[PDB]
Amino acid sequence: SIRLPAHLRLQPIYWSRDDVAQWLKWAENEFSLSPIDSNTFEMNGKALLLLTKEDFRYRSPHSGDVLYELLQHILKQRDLEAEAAAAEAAAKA
Amino acid sequence: ASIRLPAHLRLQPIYWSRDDVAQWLKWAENEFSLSPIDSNTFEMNGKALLLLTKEDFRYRSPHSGDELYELLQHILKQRPGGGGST
Amino acid sequence: GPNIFEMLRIDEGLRLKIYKDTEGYYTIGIGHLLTKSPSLNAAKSELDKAIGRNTNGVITKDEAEKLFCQDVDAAVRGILRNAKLKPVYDSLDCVRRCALINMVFQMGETGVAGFTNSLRMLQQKRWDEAAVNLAKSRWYNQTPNRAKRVITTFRTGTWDAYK
């Protein structure tokens, strides 16, 4: 299972630049990746989401694909939570 | 067959350290007569390894990547059950 | 929902532009009149005073909601000002309060107050008897569509006739 730090459990589009940086530090240790420099992703989450897998690979040759697929997994689980809260809000109202 | 299974690694890749991933590649190369795989092709643990797509395996290992992916899937099929990755 | 807005969105309906109801007079939003002059000349002028701005309308979806809510407020004030209606209304819970407002939107404060027997039966927590009573009225005959749901709401005390 993937358990994010509780402060990062928001949809990545709302991630600050700092949130992005904390995501990388967490991912590095969680996935035993080669050290990721702090300034490889100088952007907020809504910028991060515009990047392609190729972009991740150019920025992080060692871990880019892992970081990209991690993001896809995060996006997926948030999307599910969004439609679980959506179906229930319509169920009450 | 089938078996096709590492003897000194856990059969649950989610527990594999970065070192365990390197030994799995080393075992794989020998067991399957593959072209030599550089140890630093998957600088990551088993959790990270399970996030990669077949395409990502191929990018990291043009000669053996698809083989290694299907090998990883084979290991997950037997034994049960998860994980993975939620 | 279900709520008070949904009730009259089904019964009296929300239409946008100016339309004519089941009678002939002009109605905008949800059952708002309009409209003392026999033409679309002064039904076009009193709306400038009502909305706060101008022209024709054609009004926005949200302005009609405000318009509706101001009229619900007008209904409630009229009910509480009425000596024959207030004592009935004050004993009712909010689900059944909506039903009495529903009736006022249609036939008006003074029209509803004529249902003496049915109002007293609603006051004394006597739901089914008022439900059989209201069913045998002139209002029930004209539109059995709207009436069945208002009655069901009075009896059960729930929004079921809309869910």
Ligand SMILES: [N+]
């Ligand atoms: N994988």
